[PDB]
Amino acid sequence: DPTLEWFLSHCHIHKYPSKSTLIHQGEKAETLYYIVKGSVAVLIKDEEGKEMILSYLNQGDFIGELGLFEEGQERSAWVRAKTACEVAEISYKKFRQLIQVNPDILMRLSAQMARRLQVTSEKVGNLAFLDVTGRIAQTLLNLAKQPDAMTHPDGMQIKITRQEIGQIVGCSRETVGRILKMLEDQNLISAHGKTIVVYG
Amino acid sequence: DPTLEWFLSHCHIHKYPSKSTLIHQGEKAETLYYIVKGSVAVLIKDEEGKEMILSYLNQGDFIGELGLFEEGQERSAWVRAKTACEVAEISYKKFRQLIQVNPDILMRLSAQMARRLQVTSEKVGNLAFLDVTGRIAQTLLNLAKQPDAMTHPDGMQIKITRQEIGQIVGCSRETVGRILKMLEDQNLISAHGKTIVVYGT
Ligand SMILES: Nc1ncnc2c1ncn2[C@@H]1O[C@@H]2CO[P@](O)(=S)O[C@H]2[C@H]1O
Ligand SMILES: Nc1ncnc2c1ncn2[C@@H]1O[C@@H]2CO[P@](O)(=S)O[C@H]2[C@H]1O
Ligand SMILES: Nc1ncnc2c1ncn2[C@@H]1O[C@@H]2CO[P@](O)(=S)O[C@H]2[C@H]1O
Ligand SMILES: Nc1ncnc2c1ncn2[C@@H]1O[C@@H]2CO[P@](O)(=S)O[C@H]2[C@H]1O
């Protein structure tokens, strides 16, 4: 992809090990990132340090983009590497010059912003309108149709901790365990360790 | 400024009365709108027809923008006029031609998308982390911080109905009215008119 190749030639690229923080909430935003390889989690926290994952992003995703548009703003969320990552970085000032040369690179960025607004709006709906059981069931459904889910005789096999589920749906790890047991009892999933088979 | 003037010269401008739907969820998206005058709400609905307000947008805001980026998408939300609106309309096709001329028009639209994603992300946190009283309290704090809030000797004065708060936080107007009376009793707010004063705001 020539447009992305051109953009990346103007970036400087860096390796982040698994679990490192790319972006800290509250930092002053002056640069844009783009994931060349790997995946990250975007998260927010409450007064007590409970975490809610807003999104996973992966190869091909921009990160740190929301600052490009307002002079001197603070990063709104933490971004943590879930795997080893290779990340390209560019200042906003240089990226604005690229936009002038070829506004297709802004279109690519803005397409991902629009998708993220839709996804996050759906999350608002889920938190407002679904109970925690329905949120968990929708999450397991989603993880099963992810590229990293492994086919199984009876559905798809996924690997996720109860803690990570609770960070997606907004509940404690104890509440996750109780709901997973219920779904097992209903013959809708199987659960063994960090492994869950989602039937159907 | 004259960027906005030039853009509006390529649009068709039309009027929506108060309460009328501009965009329905599920319609095919092929056109972008820009609010010349008025205010709208962006809304989603649950299975029982309960509504939740995702955003209020105003003069200078783009609406219907999210479908510009990928061909053949559905509208993701309803957009309903709060006051009567005058809205400029342009096809996605024509708008993409204007972007080549001056991409500041896409910068302005994307700055608004960026802000909306931050507001909606904060809403995810509030719904995950706060109970209904806490969500009402944060809604009042958010309204007291807005440009359109009025300085008052006890704090900031806002204008918002109980039904409006309920559609924002996800509760009935009667639940809102009970909780505002409670907050008043804790000496945190005044009710009164159509009007709430958020103390220490
Ligand atoms: N709801 C959401 N969905 C996806 N990415 C998000 C998000 N909220 C914030 N981010 C990302 O998290 C980053 C935090 O730094 P920013 O410069 S505000 O840019 C932000 C986006 O890249
Ligand atoms: N309302 C909620 N209650 C409890 N935990 C929550 C929560 N919303 C998000 N979380 C996160 O979900 C996590 C699930 O595992 P924990 O180790 S109990 O830590 C929890 C918090 O970090
Ligand atoms: N969370 C949100 N905040 C603000 N506006 C939103 C929103 N979700 C959707 N919208 C607006 O609602 C519109 C519905 O039609 P679209 O073409 S998907 O464009 C959408 C945006 O203008
Ligand atoms: N959990 C909930 N309970 C009641 N109303 C809710 C709700 N979530 C969203 N709403 C909406 O909030 C509105 C507040 O005013 P109503 O006229 S009672 O109509 C209500 C519903 O449309």
Author numbering:
A (entry chain A): 9 to 208
B (entry chain B): 9 to 209
Publication text:
We used cAMP analogues to weaken CAP-cAMP interactions as an essential test of the predictions of the ENM. Fig. 4a shows the x-ray crystal structure of CAP bound to Sp-cAMPS overlaid onto the structure of CAP bound to cAMP and demonstrates no significant difference in structure (root mean square deviation = 0.24 Å over 2177 atoms). Furthermore, K2/K1 for both analogues is also increased consistent with theoretical predictions. The computed and experimental data therefore demonstrate an unambiguous relationship between ligand interaction strength and allostery.
Analysis of the two major ligand binding domains of the CAP homodimer demonstrated a homotropic negative allosteric interaction between cAMP binding sites and the absence of structural change within this domain. Negative allosteric cooperativity between cAMP binding sites in CAP occurs as a consequence of the protein-ligand contacts formed.
